[PDB]
Design a protein around this ligand. Structure first.
Ligand SMILES: [Ca+2]
Ligand SMILES: [Ca+2]
Ligand SMILES: [Ca+2]
Ligand SMILES: [Ca+2]
Ligand SMILES: [Mn+2]
Ligand SMILES: [Mn+2]
Ligand SMILES: [Mn+2]
Ligand SMILES: [Mn+2]
Lengths: 247, 249, 249, 248
C-alpha cells in the first residue's frame, strides 16, 4: 500500500500551487483579497493546492484510496447581515484551472450534473443562493455540481475559528464532514455515500477554493490557518492522524 | 512529547483488562452476557480497558494530553420498545472497580456531581431514565456523574454498526464525540468544554463499560467490534488525519 | 493490519512491568542499582518490560509481525578496564521471570540451545566472557542461548549516550541491529536470519534486561534514557522506518 | 511542528520530477538506460525527485528539521569486473539541473569543495575512481564535492536487492547512512556530523541520481524498487520506529 501525508501548522508559499487571489502571508492562507486596512474586498476568487498529485483510485487493480483532511478556517465578515460566499476543500483534476467566481466558489460551472468537471468538494457556505442552496447556513457535499447532494445546518459564528475534519472510507464509500467552533462549543456533521471511481480521475490535486460575492458591500475573509492531510491507497488511522496535525 | 498508540481491528483477550461479564469471542468484545442461542441476557455488567494506563495531565509541568479514540460498536436488541441500558467509552482511575449496573453503566454512583469518582465518559444511551435522561436516544458526556452535562439526539439503529470518533483537545479544552451509521449514512455529534485537571487523576485506565436493565425483557447486546486510540503529552509547554486511516479507515 | 506504537522520551513507573533491581528515578530507567552518591553496585540484576503484551505472529493466519525499536542507553563504569556486564533488548514470554545473573544478563540458563526459554534478545556486551564471547566488546543476536549466533565489533565509549535501532522484517526473516555513538560519530551494525515462529511464542513481553558483575570492582551503570517501539501484524508488508524514527524519539 | 511523509512501494511518473534518462516502468524506477532486451547502456544519466520541496531549516527561528529516508535499490551488471558508476540519494536545490555524468554521478563538478552546488548526497559507489575514491566499493557522504568527507567498505552484491536507511538527527547534527543486503545477510554503516545550515538552502528537492561509464563495456543497471521519506520541522529551538514500518 502506498502512503502520502503532510501537516501545515503554518502556511508556506514554496510548497503550494497557488491560483488567482489565493496568497500566503504571515502564516495564514488568505484565499481572498483584503484591503490595506485588512477589510475584505468583493469579487475575489482564490485557489490553493498541494504540490504533489494524489492517486485516489486505480484503474487496473480496482482499489480505492481512503483519505482524511483536517484544517482550521476563519470567515470574518464586517457585517454578518451581508456576507459572501464561502470556502471549500476540493479534490480537483491535476492541471485544472478555476471556474466560476461567487456562489460557484471557483469549482463549478452550473447547477445541473456535469461530470466533465470531475470535482468533489465539501463547501462551507455563508451566502444563501436560492438557485440551489438550502434555507440556512450549511455544510454541503458537492459532486460535479454546486447543487449539494446533502447538506447540514450550520451556526456560522462570525470571525470565529472553525476546526474541520473530512474522511473518506473506501470500504463503505462514505464521506464525513464535521465542524466545530471551540470558542462557542457548537458542533456539526454531514455524511454521504460517494463513488470516487465514477467521479474523479485516478490522479487529483488536493486543496482549497474560496470566493466573495457579486455586490460590493457583501464582503468577508476566507482564511485557512492550518491544514493536515493523509491518504492510503491499498494494494486509514484516525486516532494517530489528528494528533500529529490537528491536536 | 510522549506518545501512545494502538489499533485493534479484532479484539484479543491477551492485551486488555477484562472485568465482570466482559468477554472476547470470535474477535468481538462482548461486554454484556449472551445466551447459548445468541440471545442478550438481563442483569449484566461488563468492563474492558487497555493494558497500559495513560498520563492525561502532568502535575509538575501543568501540561495536558491531547488524545483521540475511534471504535465501531453494535447494539442489537430483540424488542426496540424495551431495551437497556447502553455502552460507554470511559476514562477511569488506574485501579478502578465496577460500580452500579443498570442505568449507571458500571461507572457512576449518583446523579449529583460526585468528584470522588473521577471519571470522564462518553455514553451511548438506549434506555431513558426520566430522573436524569433526556427524551430520545442520546449521546451523553458524563463528568463525575451519570447526569450528563450535555446531550444530543442520536437516532439509534438496531443491530447496525456505529463508527465513533472521540477527541479531547488540550489547547481548546474541547471534547468532541461524533458517530456514524455507515449503512444509513446518518451522523451525530456533541462537543463540550471539559477540564481534565479538575476531574480526572494524573494517570487513567482507558476503555469500555456496558450494562443491561433491571427487568427480564429489557435486553440488548453491548458489543465493540474494533478499537483505535492515540495520545500525546507535551513535555515542554495530535494529527486527526493520519490517526483514523491507520485505524478507522 | 494490527498496530502498536509508543514513545518514551521520559520513563514512568506505572506503564512499566518492573522486575527485581530495575528502578525508575527522575525520568531515567536505572535497570541496575545505584548509591546515593552515584556508585554502581555489584550483584545487580534488572529487568523492565512494557505493560501490554504483543502478538508477534498469529497461528491461524500464519502471519508474522514486523517490528522496530529505537532507544538511548548509557553505560558508565568507574574503572573501564573491569566492567560488567551489559544490557539487552529482549522479546520474552509474557509471564517470564528473571534468569541467571552476571554475563547471562538475566535471559538464559546455558550457552547451548534450549528452546524451553522461547527468547530472542539483542545484547550489548561490555564484559567479554571467554567461554562464549568473541574478544572485543560486541552487539549479539541471542537465540535461546547466551552465546550469540552472530556478533560484531563495538567501540563501547564509557559513560556515553548510545542510540540504538533494532528492526525485524518478516518478509526476509531479517533482524538488523545498529548502534551509533553520536558523541564520537561512530557506527556499528549486525544482521542475521531468524524465524520468530520457532523461537518465540505468539504473544510476548517487550522490554529491557541488564546486570552487574560478581566482583566489588566489576561495576557499571545500566541506564536507558529514552525508548521507542512499533509493530505491525498483518491480516493477509515492510515496516515504515522513515516515518517511525521521527515519530519515535 | 510541521510534518511531511510518503511511501512509494511502486513508483509512478505522476508524482515525480524526472530528468534525462530516468524513467518509470512497471512500478520500478529505472534511472539509467536499459535496452529493450534488458541490456544496460553506457553513457547514461538519470535523476528523479519528489514533487514537493522540503524545508530542512528555517532562517527566522533557527529551527532545523530532522528527517529520514528508506529505499530499496538493485544494481545489476553483465560483467561484474567492469561496471560504472553508481547511484545516490540527494537533497538538492529547489530547481537544480543534472551536472557531470559518469564518475561524478550527475551531481558534482569537481573534486574540490564548492558550496555553490549546495548538495548533500549519500552515494553508493560501484566504480573506484583513482582520483578521489577508496580502493573498493563504498558508501560515501558527499558534501558539495564528489570526494567524500567520509566512507565505508561496501560489499556490492551483483543483481541483488539492497535496503538503505538514511537518518539525520538534528539534535546531534549526525547523518547516519546504512545498507543491508537481505539475500546475503550483510550490513554496512557510515555516520558523520553534517550541519545543514552551512550546506543546504532552506528549501530542498529530495531524490535520486545515477550514471554509467564513458567506456562502452562498463555497464550496469541503476534501479530503485521502493521509497520512503519523512521530515519534522519544529517551531521552537523523529521516530525511526514508527517510520520504518509505516514506511516501505
Ligand atoms: Ca452559496
Ligand atoms: Ca439511562
Ligand atoms: Ca558477556
Ligand atoms: Ca566512483
Ligand atoms: Mn451551498
Ligand atoms: Mn443518558
Ligand atoms: Mn556476547
Ligand atoms: Mn565514491
Amino acid at each position: 500500500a502506498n502512503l502520502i501525508s503532510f501537516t501545515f501548522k503554518k502556511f508556506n508559499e514554496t510548497n503550494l500551487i497557488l491560483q488567482r487571489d489565493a496568497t500566503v502571508s504571515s502564516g495564514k492562507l488568505r484565499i481572498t483579497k483584503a484591503a490595506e486596512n485588512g477589510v475584505p474586498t468583493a469579487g475575489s476568487l482564490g485557489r490553493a493546492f498541494y504540490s504533489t498529485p494524489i492517486q485516489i483510485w486505480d484503474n487496473t487493480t480496482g482499489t480505492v484510496a481512503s483519505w482524511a483532511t483536517s484544517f482550521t478556517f476563519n470567515l470574518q465578515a464586517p457585517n454578518a447581515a451581508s456576507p459572501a460566499d464561502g470556502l471549500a476543500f476540493a479534490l480537483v483534476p491535476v492541471g485544472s484551472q478555476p471556474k466560476d467566481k461567487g456562489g460557484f466558489l471557483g469549482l463549478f460551472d452550473s447547477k445541473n450534473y456535469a461530470s466533465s468537471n470531475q470535482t468533489v468538494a465539501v463547501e462551507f457556505d455563508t451566502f444563501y443562493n436560492g438557485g440551489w442552496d438550502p434555507t440556512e447556513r450549511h455544510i454541503g457535499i458537492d459532486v460535479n455540481s454546486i447543487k449539494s447532494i446533502k447538506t447540514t445546518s450550520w451556526d456560522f459564528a462570525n470571525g470565529e475559528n472553525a476546526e474541520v475534519l473530512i474522511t473518506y472510507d473506501s470500504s463503505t464509500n462514505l464521506l464525513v464532514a464535521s465542524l466545530v467552533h471551540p470558542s462557542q462549543k457548537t458542533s456539526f456533521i454531514v455524511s454521504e455515500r460517494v463513488d470516487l471511481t465514477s467521479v474523479l480521475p485516478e490522479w487529483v490535486s488536493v486543496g482549497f477554493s474560496a470566493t466573495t460575492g457579486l455586490s460590493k458591500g457583501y464582503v468577508e475573509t476566507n482564511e485557512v490557518l492550518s491544514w493536515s492531510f493523509a491518504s492510503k491507497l491499498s494494494i486509514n488511522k484516525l486516532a494517530i492522524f489528528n494528533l500529529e496535525g490537528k491536536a
